[PDB]
Design an enzyme around this catalytic site. Structure first.
Site, mmCIF file in Angstrom:
data_model
loop_
_atom_site.group_PDB
_atom_site.id
_atom_site.type_symbol
_atom_site.label_atom_id
_atom_site.label_comp_id
_atom_site.label_asym_id
_atom_site.label_seq_id
_atom_site.Cartn_x
_atom_site.Cartn_y
_atom_site.Cartn_z
ATOM 1 N N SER B 127 0.781 -1.241 0.000
ATOM 2 C CA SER B 127 0.000 0.000 0.000
ATOM 3 C C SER B 127 0.814 1.292 0.000
ATOM 4 C CB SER B 127 -0.995 0.009 1.158
ATOM 5 O OG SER B 127 -1.912 -1.058 1.010
ATOM 6 N N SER B 142 7.517 -0.295 3.487
ATOM 7 C CA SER B 142 6.436 -0.691 4.382
ATOM 8 C C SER B 142 6.918 -0.978 5.800
ATOM 9 C CB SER B 142 5.713 -1.921 3.827
ATOM 10 O OG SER B 142 5.319 -1.709 2.486
ATOM 11 N N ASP B 151 19.707 3.320 26.982
ATOM 12 C CA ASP B 151 18.943 3.407 28.229
ATOM 13 C C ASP B 151 19.151 4.749 28.961
ATOM 14 O OD1 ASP B 151 18.530 1.181 31.134
ATOM 15 O OD2 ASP B 151 17.272 2.772 30.325
ATOM 16 N N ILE B 153 17.323 9.119 29.010
ATOM 17 C CA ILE B 153 16.246 10.003 28.548
ATOM 18 C C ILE B 153 16.530 10.546 27.139
ATOM 19 C CG2 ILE B 153 15.089 12.228 28.964
ATOM 20 C CD1 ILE B 153 13.900 10.104 30.569
ATOM 21 N N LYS B 168 4.859 8.794 10.654
ATOM 22 C CA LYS B 168 4.165 9.892 9.981
ATOM 23 C C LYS B 168 4.038 9.629 8.480
ATOM 24 C CE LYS B 168 6.599 13.364 9.192
ATOM 25 N NZ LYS B 168 7.239 14.621 8.663
ATOM 26 N N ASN B 343 9.319 -7.330 12.720
ATOM 27 C CA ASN B 343 8.624 -6.082 12.431
ATOM 28 C C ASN B 343 7.198 -6.056 12.964
ATOM 29 O OD1 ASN B 343 7.913 -8.002 10.259
ATOM 30 N ND2 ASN B 343 6.830 -6.246 9.345
ATOM 31 N N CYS B 345 4.527 -6.922 11.524
ATOM 32 C CA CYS B 345 3.759 -8.102 11.109
ATOM 33 C C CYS B 345 4.533 -9.426 11.207
ATOM 34 C CB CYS B 345 3.205 -7.913 9.691
ATOM 35 S SG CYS B 345 2.120 -6.439 9.475
ATOM 36 N N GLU B 347 7.263 -10.688 9.840
ATOM 37 C CA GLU B 347 7.781 -11.399 8.681
ATOM 38 C C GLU B 347 9.193 -10.944 8.320
ATOM 39 O OE1 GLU B 347 6.092 -7.997 6.150
ATOM 40 O OE2 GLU B 347 5.925 -8.771 8.176
ATOM 41 N N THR B 525 -1.400 -9.493 3.291
ATOM 42 C CA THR B 525 -1.678 -8.769 2.059
ATOM 43 C C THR B 525 -2.890 -7.876 2.251
ATOM 44 O OG1 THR B 525 -2.793 -10.779 1.220
ATOM 45 C CG2 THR B 525 -0.539 -10.373 0.471
ATOM 46 N N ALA B 526 -3.841 -8.350 3.051
ATOM 47 C CA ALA B 526 -4.963 -7.540 3.523
ATOM 48 C C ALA B 526 -5.649 -6.747 2.422
ATOM 49 C CB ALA B 526 -4.502 -6.610 4.629
#
Lengths: 654, 654
Positions: B127, B142, B151, B153, B168, B343, B345, B347, B525-526
């Site tokens: 997408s 993607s 470790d 701030i 974003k 990641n 998803c 994969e 793939t959705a």
């Protein structure tokens, strides 16, 4: 009662007498569970103490520990004294000697002088300074004024990072955000709008909880203004609130005028109307009006906004109100550019920019400590000469701190090393009036208020000129109001009261400069004035009381016989008030008027009076009976026309 | 129904035929309300189109727009097609031509080839690639694998900034945090403890809402492990949750063993036990055990943890499970260092570090598009030669993207330019079996699964070797498994199936190298597989159905007469299942077994089969009846011993 001396003496028994050895232990301290060396004293101070231990050890008068009252001391115990394995390892006298060393370093004379004066309760420094002075990374500064770096995810996120780094130390923060685009504004290379300030504020709210609270400053023309002011509303719409941050308003004169004349008021996104916050007074009103004409914003009835603001103030005690034009017209820092915010407590007024985070160190003089019976006895008067002498010391202390401070972010160090602002305040104003038997609202109280601040301002500028003679003026002195001999009161177009010689001072300032660009910002004293046993800063008492009754009230009640049980009972069930009480001498009723019983017009008057001797601003809390929309309006408008910088801090209620 | 052709034809009437002019308009676009020039086409592509408009214009077959089904097309309309003032300005054929141009640039031949193949539904890109290819700042990647920088701030806040910048754009994120100290850990120069991962996670949750969801990876020895796994629990304890992020587990073999043998399991803070996540297998288990002996952590019953994990998985569908040792033992990127996360998803399996954010571009081949009736008719077979040919193209496309991508953060660009990972997947596996009438669980389905993936892997490595012959290997090829001629299946210690010639390929790989360090990562793939009208990726159907019934099911039902009303009614009130149905031929019942009716042991088997031809990993969703604690355990342990990388993605329920 007899509890203080109980609590203190027990500290003496579980505590090593001998400052040099307690330093040794703190410096040697090691985290038992982790095995980590965890010194609570800097290398620098440990060494100094070691090379002077006999001189240091024998300067301490452990008598002075018994002088704090039960609740005063337990404030120190709970928070201020250095702990070992949850065990108090510091006496109040160690605390003080350490703080003195952390400030003065190898200047042993000054260190003992600071020690003596503090141990005798002539003055005290702010809590960060008490926590951190003498410790490894001494973050002694109380205030940080942060510029929102840029209207982008980078700028926002860089700013957030910076606030986290700051708030993690003992730093309070004032953050101005007038440059963040509003709801629905266009975003290049996307298709959905912008969701404005509130979500971005949720981010900052969230970072405050994770880590020095935040105040956010916004001018009232910003298109997200209506939601911004309601941040603290407890009937929240949930994801539109932010219960841990404070709205402060950065108000231009033009808004007040528009409200006043029942006129229009246009809202803009910064993107549609650039530069609004980088100018003030006439330049702003010319620019503003043009953007109005050009249809760049959304016009409304100004009094709708005004009305909402009042509703939030009534309901939440915020937003604070700080007049942007007063602040810029009457700032010695005006040669730096346009000042865009105040601080967490609305007393600091300093220039901040993406690369410059304004910083300040605070200390408060204990006003009542200069009261003395005159050369005879039928009096008790005020020693302005001693007050002057001590202010000169505090001024030197606060200046030393600038150099010995560990700065959390490079922006803060860059800013403070250039301009060297300082901020002296007071506590015990309400006590001082009471010891001299001056009602707060009296003409002598009004007089004494004026005089006290003229000598603190004079003394501080005098100390600071002397320092500039030693070390040169601060980097940006040339071109400022002061380099021309314009001082604070001059900018209010007033003659000083005349108790001190301003002409000579002004002469030397013009000749030699001043080490500090600002010096005076009466702050909330809070915890420090409970340690010292006096009343908060410059405000009157909020109430005269299995509780604790006002000590001067008590003396008087007893001294007249009328103190007893059907008496005691009367104040408790009267929230510290003594008015409408059957048998109290009128003069006590006026002397012990609680702040809910004192006219706010009076409060504002005195604020305005002293304001002429204030380089920066002061944390003017306002107090209302049952607030009314008309009374608030009168209150704000009175202060605004009085030319106040901070028109309002909190709105204390009922 | 007849609605698709209704919806499509109406797009034709409110849309300019002539790609060159729609490009003109998109490129010329200007935000009406703001007056801002807002091009939706890059300078680069606009120019190309202009210098070739007649060639481009006449390559487009607008016939092909009618081939999407109503709900397929409306997916494109709702999200993918470029809009003007909320008005669709793009035909599906424009979308595709643009995407092709955005990938290939001045290579017009390739552009038309990509166009033809995509327009005929041979394959599609992910997408982000459909959204952004050809547009000004083309963020086509993607996946982003992010290392928690440090470790502190600073590190935390630098990482947060980086995730915001990434999310974003169209970027999904996997973030590993094994180096963040746990609750109660010591913090130098403070007095209060650390509040651990959960508050820090609240910060990230909050930044995701403000802006590409986040998956967070954590190894199961981390002291905050019990709360971490419960992030998504809906009976939340409120401030201890984080309903918008996903827990994924980075599991070492040692944990699984400890669970299995009902042994102990020790929890550590990273601070008390350094290096745990920068080693694996034996090196880890040696280091782990030593820290156990040395009392550095808090030992428990391993099965308590295991039990909780199951409870969260049952209740929330997470945490995901990805076996850290499989991932490192069997990665061609192992010469880079230890891989610490997958990641969003589950994969992608690539190396990430504070200065290197792993990136991937995805595309999915449409499996059913290579089904064809053989040289006669009594069949329909599978054209592995065409499948091979197309995979070679997609491989070249995905590689072009690496170079034409706008990288959101410099870490991502540094990482991808060095190693050039790529990720090919599939959709329509369940359709393909159905068109050939192979039950999912059948021995031919098992065979076909194996074969399909061997040619996709072979083809991709072949294309990639060819590219390395043109442009050199990726920067870090020397020293990798592949440079020695070790390929994916070799690392599973298996001989390939033999349908393609691996010896020659391996010869050329060793001689010339490969352009891409990885090539294969079957993803969800959705939305793309609803556009193309096939079933999600490699999974079986979830159900065979004022609804929409399975098309192949329907053909069959009708072709036998038994399709009607007291029939239709039967599936609806049976959630797409056809088992236990009075009059359906046994063979259909087996062909149309829904995933709740297919053994999970089978699922895992096939996953393992194809896994030998997968450079990275694949998004193995698991499906359970009414889950049981023993069945989940059997399920995970089966996959783990099968040597799966991703033991589990979601746990789909009931």
């Amino acid at each position: 009662t007899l509890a203080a001396r109980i609590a203190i003496s027990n500290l003496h028994k579980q505590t090593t007498k001998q400052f040099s050895k307690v330093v040794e232990d703190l410096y040697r301290y090691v985290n038992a569970a982790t095995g980590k060396p965890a010194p609570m004293i800097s290398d620098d101070v440990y060494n100094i103490v070691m090379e002077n231990k006999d001189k240091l050890n024998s300067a301490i008068v452990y008598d002075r520990d018994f002088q704090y009252s039960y609740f005063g001391f337990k404030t120190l115990e709970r928070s201020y004294l250095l702990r070992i394995n949850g065990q108090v390892a510091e006496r109040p006298q160690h605390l003080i000697m350490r703080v003195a060393l952390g400030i003065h370093g190898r200047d042993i004379e000054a260190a003992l002088e600071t020690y003596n004066l503090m141990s005798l309760k002539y003055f005290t420094h702010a809590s960060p300074t008490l926590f951190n002075a003498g410790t490894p990374k001494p973050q002694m500064s109380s205030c940080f004024l942060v510029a929102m770096k840029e209207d982008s995810i980078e700028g926002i996120y860089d700013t957030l990072k910076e606030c986290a780094l700051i708030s993690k130390t003992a730093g309070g923060i004032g953050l101005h955000i007038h440059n963040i685009r509003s709801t629905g504004s266009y975003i290049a290379g996307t298709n959905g709008t912008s969701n404005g300030l509130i979500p971005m504020i949720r981010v900052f709210n969230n970072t405050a909880r994770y880590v020095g609270a935040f105040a956010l400053y916004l001018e009232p023309w910003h298109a997200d203004i209506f939601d911004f002011i309601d941040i603290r509303k407890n009937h929240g719409k949930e994801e539109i609130r932010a219960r841990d941050l404070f709205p402060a308003l950065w108000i231009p004169d033009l808004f007040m005028k528009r409200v006043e004349e029942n006129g229009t008021w246009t809202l803009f996104s910064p993107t549609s109307a650039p530069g609004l916050s980088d100018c003030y007074g006439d330049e702003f009103e010319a620019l503003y009006t043009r953007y109005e004409k050009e249809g760049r914003g959304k016009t409304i009835k100004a009094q709708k906004l005004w009305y909402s603001i009042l509703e939030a103030q009534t309901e939440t005690g915020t937003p604070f109100v700080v007049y942007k034009d007063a602040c810029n017209r009457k700032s010695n820092q005006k040669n730096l550019g346009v000042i865009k915010s105040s601080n967490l407590c609305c007393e600091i007024v300093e220039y901040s920019a993406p690369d410059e985070t304004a910083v300040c160190n605070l200390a408060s003089v204990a006003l009542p400590a200069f009261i003395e019976t005159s050369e005879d006895g039928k009096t008790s008067t005020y020693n302005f000469k001693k007050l002057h002498e001590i202010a000169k010391v505090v001024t030197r202390n606060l200046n030393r701190v600038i150099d010995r401070n560990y700065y959390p972010v490079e922006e803060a160090r860059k800013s403070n090393m250039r301009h060297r602002p300082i901020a002296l305040g007071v506590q015990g104003l309400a006590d001082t009036f009471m010891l001299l038997r001056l009602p707060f609202d009296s003409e002598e109280a009004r007089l004494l208020n004026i005089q006290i601040f003229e000598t603190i301002y004079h003394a501080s500028m005098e100390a600071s000129c002397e320092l500039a003679q030693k070390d040169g003026p601060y980097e940006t002195f040339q071109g400022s109001p002061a380099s021309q001999g314009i001082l604070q009161f001059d900018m209010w177009d007033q003659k000083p009261y005349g108790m001190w010689d301003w002409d000579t001072l002004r002469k030397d300032i013009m000749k030699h400069g001043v080490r500090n660009s600002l010096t005076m910002a009466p702050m909330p004293t809070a915890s420090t004035s409970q340690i010292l046993g006096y009343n908060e800063c410059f405000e009157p008492v909020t109430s005269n009381m299995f509780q604790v009754v006002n000590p001067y009230l008590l003396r008087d009640l007893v001294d007249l016989g009328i103190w007893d049980e059907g008496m005691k009972q009367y104040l408790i069930t009267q929230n510290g008030s003594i008015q409408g009480l059957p048998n109290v001498p009128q003069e006590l009723k006026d002397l012990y008027k609680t702040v809910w019983e004192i006219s706010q017009k009076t409060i504002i008057n005195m604020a305005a009076d002293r304001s002429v001797y204030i380089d920066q601003s002061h944390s003017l809390n306002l107090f209302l009976r049952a607030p009314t929309m008309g009374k608030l309006t009168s209150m704000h408008f009175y202060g605004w026309k009085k030319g106040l910088k901070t028109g309002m801090y909190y709105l204390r209620t009922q």
